[PDB]
Design a protein around this ligand. Sequence first.
Ligand SMILES: NC(=[NH2+])c1ccsc1
Length: 223
Amino acid sequence: IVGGYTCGANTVPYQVSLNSGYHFCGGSLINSQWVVSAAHCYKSGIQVRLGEDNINVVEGNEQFISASKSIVHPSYNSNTLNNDIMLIKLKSAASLNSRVASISLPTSCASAGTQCLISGWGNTKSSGTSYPDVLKCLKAPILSDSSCKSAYPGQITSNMFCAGYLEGGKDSCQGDSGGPVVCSGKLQGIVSWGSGCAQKNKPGVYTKVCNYVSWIKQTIASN
Ligand SMILES: NC(=[NH2+])c1ccsc1
C-alpha cells in the first residue's frame, strides 16, 4: 500500500496473508474454512495465516492453517487478468473471534463514489521497494467505469473496477494482490493489478466481487 496508514493490529480481522515460506499475496476470510484471493496468486503449497499484524513476528492472535485445495475461476485469463479470483479452502476451520473474522459477500455491486478500505502488506513505495511488516490501510473511492476505461484503454472488462486517486500518490501495490477492498462492510473488490503503483492517471484495478457471488456460493456448497 502506497500512501496509506498503519491499520492497527487486528483491526482488519478478515485480512489474511498467503504464505509459501514467505508472504506473497493477501486474501479475505469469507467463512471459517474459505478464503477469497486473486487467481494470479495461485500456487502450490499455500499456508493461510490469519490474525496477523507484523507478518515477521508471532504476537499471539495468529492461526496458521494449510490449504487443502484451491479453485481458480474457470474463466480466469492470466494474460488479461479477466476473472482474477480464486477460492482457497482451509484444511481445518479457523476459530473465529473478534480478531479473526469473516467478511460478508456483497448483496449488490457498489457504485462509483463509494468509499472503501483497501489493505495489505505490499510495497509502500511507488519508486523502489520497502515492505512494511505491519498491515497498511488505505481509504479510497471507487472510480467511474468511464474514468477507469479512459485510464486503461482496451484493458478494463466488466469484471474489473478502478479505485483510488487519479492524481496518484495513494494506491495498492505489489504484494497487496489478492487482498480485500471492503465497502460498507462488504467485500466488493480483490486487489488485482495496475501500471506501477500510485502513478498519476493509473489507479488500482480490482476484481469485481459482486459478479462472482453465485459462483462463490455454489463452489463452497459442493467443495
Ligand atoms: N497499482 C496497483 N494497484 C497494483 C496492484 C497490484 S500490483 C499494482
